[PDB]
Amino acid sequence: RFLKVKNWETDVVLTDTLHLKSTLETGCTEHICMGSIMLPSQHTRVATKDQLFPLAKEFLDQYYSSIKRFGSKAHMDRLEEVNKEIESTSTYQLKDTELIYGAKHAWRNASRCVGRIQWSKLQVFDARDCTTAHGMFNYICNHVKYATNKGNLRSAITIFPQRTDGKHDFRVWNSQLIRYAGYKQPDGSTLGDPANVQFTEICIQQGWKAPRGRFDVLPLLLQANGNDPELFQIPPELVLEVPIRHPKFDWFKDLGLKWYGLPAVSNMLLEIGGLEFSACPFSGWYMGTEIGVRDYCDNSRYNILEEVAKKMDLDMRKTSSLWKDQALVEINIAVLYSFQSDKVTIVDHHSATESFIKHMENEYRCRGGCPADWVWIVPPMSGSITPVFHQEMLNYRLTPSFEYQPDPWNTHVWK
Amino acid sequence: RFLKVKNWETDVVLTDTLHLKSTLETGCTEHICMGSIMLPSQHTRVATKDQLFPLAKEFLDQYYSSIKRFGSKAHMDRLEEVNKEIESTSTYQLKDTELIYGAKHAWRNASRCVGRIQWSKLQVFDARDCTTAHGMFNYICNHVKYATNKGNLRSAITIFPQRTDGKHDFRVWNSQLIRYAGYKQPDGSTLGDPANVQFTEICIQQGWKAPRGRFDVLPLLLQANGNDPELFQIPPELVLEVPIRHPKFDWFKDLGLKWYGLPAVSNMLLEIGGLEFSACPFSGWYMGTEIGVRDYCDNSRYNILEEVAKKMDLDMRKTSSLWKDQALVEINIAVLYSFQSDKVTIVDHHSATESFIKHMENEYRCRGGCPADWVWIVPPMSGSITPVFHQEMLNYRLTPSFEYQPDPWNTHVWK
Numbered sequence A, B: 001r002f003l004k005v006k007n008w009e010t011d012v013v014l015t016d017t018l019h020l021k022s023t024l025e026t027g028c029t030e031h032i033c034m035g036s037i038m039l040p041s042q043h044t045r046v047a048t049k050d051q052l053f054p055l056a057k058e059f060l061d062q063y064y065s066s067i068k069r070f071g072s073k074a075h076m077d078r079l080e081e082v083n084k085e086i087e088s089t090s091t092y093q094l095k096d097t098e099l100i101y102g103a104k105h106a107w108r109n110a111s112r113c114v115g116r117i118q119w120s121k122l123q124v125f126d127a128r129d130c131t132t133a134h135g136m137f138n139y140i141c142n143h144v145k146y147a148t149n150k151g152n153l154r155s156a157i158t159i160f161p162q163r164t165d166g167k168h169d170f171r172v173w174n175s176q177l178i179r180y181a182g183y184k185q186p187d188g189s190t191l192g193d194p195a196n197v198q199f200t201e202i203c204i205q206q207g208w209k210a211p212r213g214r215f216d217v218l219p220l221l222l223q224a225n226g227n228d229p230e231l232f233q234i235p236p237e238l239v240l241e242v243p244i245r246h247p248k249f250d251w252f253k254d255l256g257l258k259w260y261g262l263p264a265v266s267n268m269l270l271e272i273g274g275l276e277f278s279a280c281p282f283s284g285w286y287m288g289t290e291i292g293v294r295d296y297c298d299n300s301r302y303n304i305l306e307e308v309a310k311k312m313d314l315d316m317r318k319t320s321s322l323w324k325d326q327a328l329v330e331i332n333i334a335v336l337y338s339f340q341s342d343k344v345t346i347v348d349h350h351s352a353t354e355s356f357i358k359h360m361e362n363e364y365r366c367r368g369g370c371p372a373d374w375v376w377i378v379p380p381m382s383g384s385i386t387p388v389f390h391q392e393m394l395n396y397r398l399t400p401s402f403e404y405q406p407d408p409w410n411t412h413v414w415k
């Protein structure tokens, strides 16, 4: 009940008591580990009024514990006040300071996030007075502009009104605010981003006129208070992009690769005090590997290892030549360089992972632990030359949290 | 109770019912996942006679199930025969065919092993008539010669007598049969292999006369029937080694790197039918990354990324140049090439991982599943360009199995 995690590179040992406060479940049992299941049923999100008050009580107690005012008059009165409002309405509303705390601690608790050293530096935009798709668009554009900050990126999140009945739900139908379109061809091959091909079909189903190229920024699909979603185009001056060149290969511009500067996840659920925020897009800055490994070199994403190996003149006959590994390192030297030469914030997988170990140290000290998912923290290349490969990590679910949620087109009662 | 695992690169879905036969525990609960703990307490190994018979019964039933003779006369008589012997002796002895089956299925069940497609092609050497360290040495040398097979390596395992009282235990004190010595210096730096530095001190404590170099093959330390272990030197003609050159860099010989061809783990426990085999060394062939990533480039192993980056003339100033990733891919093109040019069996991390997916397919068909530890299966470089990165895997403990055991010098009642 006082577990220990070791780093088998430095022999550092930390002690985890935080997992005692843990509430939700993991998917594992004593007889089977689910640690490599992508979307476990305990990570996916309808609630009533009986279960609500304990969830509110649990949240309000940790909030007042954090301002060195636990159990005081202001705590007890707010406990009774939310209790009162949950009788009256069978729901309740968070204070501004409560929303900011819950939002930041959802990120803090995100065990698959390697960038959490910044969790306290998060800018919270309260969009809970929004009522239309157009208002959603306005709020999202101000988010994009603010977080982009001319390439000196800044962490932020915009929180739309909380779910209530469940059929009046605010939903961003994009999985990320800025994504490139994906279109299939006659022969079955795919132009653009093969992930978004279904979403691209939906946007044209709603009337998008596609420029049918590679790096075509998708339009937003915004559903407000349960109404059918509407299409909006982020003004291009707000979508910052970095063209990818290499600091050795003058044939790398000829590849003609570029990527948007702002990672901004929009499709997931923010859970605070028992309340569910079905639309809560959040942005930070890219770690190199997310673009140069996953985006560019996944077999079912952009799939460029084929071509980078060609221009490098590599031994592509045999698999054991490691031509794939060799073109993969060049692509990532290139993404990093290209972003860095444009003053656009990016972080390499080595500095990001070192900082996470530093972050883990602080969380075991002033908090008693830090939930972490090794499967997701270790970077997708060069695993064991980074200090997170060698760090034991305890995974557990604390709340406030970010949860996966089903796509709205599989659930939205249409019209 | 009929779980599903998905591959998020090919959309392949397999169905696991095998985990129902699972017995031992994992370390996870419903509220915490231990999936990245290195040596969990459920992976480490003293038993009595009451618990023994169910363990024997469970094993004998699966053995006779596998020869299409389940519950027949030969099964029922052998069930009563082992029952009889467990009354008489409070232990029992495996048939030769039973030892071979249990041994092969321990490997089959090894969830952290990526090379298991070969589990049925395993050569089992019955050493259970051995009584002295010298006999252990003889058996181990014949193992080394056989598995090495002039570089056309062959899987094998040599099984010494089973534990009984627990104080008359057969133990190979080396963690691997062939390992290079590790000696520290005056200034505190380390020559050779920094892992084995404590073992190297023990061997000299027993009287090894060290040549005090880098790649000095360690001598065997063999404990027989609980007696104090004795030193023996594998005849060098039996230790096959591959010097590492690169197929481009004529300065790579100048590095002067070499590695032994035979990976042969000796320190772990084979569990069959309830019986514990405390000495059971097993060998196969190397996957490239185990040498060129972990052995050569771990910070606390050989730590050569420093020097390979120098001769390549790399941007070693800044971390975001990925000079570490770049020297790591060259080292692994080199290990592979060097072994392959000497007809010494090796496998690159790409072909090994593809074959494991193929193996997983067969195990879900003719067995209903396949326990797998994602944390250990994914290779330590280029993770997501290999098909195991994208495969969900269920981990669970089936028996017969290989278990970790404490080092004998922390337990051996000396003299």
Ligand code: HEM
Pocket: A043, A107, A110, A111, A112, A113, A114, A115, A116, A118, A122, A155, A156, A157, A282, A283, A284, A285, A286, A287, A290, A347, A352, A376, A402
């Ligand atoms: C500030 C810079 C940030 C960096 C460098 C970063 C990096 C990463 C990376 C590499 C992943 C793995 C995802 C993947 O590989 O697809 C991840 C996941 C995640 N991040 Fe962070 N992130 C940042 C900011 C944020 C912010 C602002 C939030 C929320 C407020 C956040 C919450 C999450 C969540 C919820 C996940 C996924 C957890 C899951 O799958 O359940 N991150 N991040």
Ligand code: HEM
Pocket: B043, B107, B110, B111, B112, B113, B114, B115, B116, B118, B122, B155, B156, B157, B282, B283, B284, B285, B286, B287, B290, B347, B352, B376, B402
């Ligand atoms: C035939 C070629 C083989 C290959 C290519 C191979 C490859 C590997 C690799 C890469 C690992 C991870 C270990 C590490 O990174 O340190 C591993 C682990 C392991 N292998 Fe295999 N191996 C082979 C043969 C065998 C044999 C013959 C046995 C037993 C009869 C075996 C049983 C195991 C076990 C028990 C583990 C570790 C499980 C644990 O940590 O609990 N392997 N193997």
Ligand SMILES: Cc1cc(N)nc(COc2cc(CCN3CCCCC3)cc(F)c2F)c1
Pocket: A115, A263, A264, A265, A268, A282, A283, A284, A285, A286, A287, A290
């Ligand atoms: C703010 C931010 C910064 C950064 N640098 N990176 C990210 C990436 O964060 C996430 C990434 C995903 C990916 C989901 N996954 C992708 C592969 C296939 C299956 C679905 C889901 C999430 F919820 C995330 F927060 C976010």
Ligand SMILES: Cc1cc(N)nc(COc2cc(CCN3CCCCC3)cc(F)c2F)c1
Pocket: B115, B263, B264, B265, B268, B282, B283, B284, B285, B286, B287, B290
């Ligand atoms: C036959 C064989 C072939 C191959 N290609 N490879 C291996 C490596 O197999 C093992 C490797 C280990 C390593 C233990 N670990 C190393 C790092 C630090 C901590 C302890 C433990 C085991 F039991 C193994 F079977 C074995």
Ligand SMILES: C[C@H](O)[C@H](O)[C@H]1CNc2nc(N)[nH]c(=O)c2N1
Pocket: A036, A037, A038, A375, A376, A377, B008, B389, B390, B391, B392, B393
């Ligand atoms: C099968 C496995 O669960 C899946 O591929 C996961 C593995 N770890 C990951 N880690 C990160 N950061 N991102 C991912 O998409 C994944 N995918």
Ligand SMILES: C[C@H](O)[C@H](O)[C@H]1CNc2nc(N)[nH]c(=O)c2N1
Pocket: A008, A389, A390, A391, A392, A393, B036, B037, B038, B375, B376, B377
């Ligand atoms: C902390 C973590 O459990 C540890 O570093 C593990 C991770 N996965 C591994 N995987 C393999 N194949 N070999 C290892 O030594 C390890 N080490």
Ligand SMILES: [Zn+2]
Pocket: A028, A032, A033, A034, A035, B028, B032, B033, B034, B035
């Ligand atoms: Zn688990």
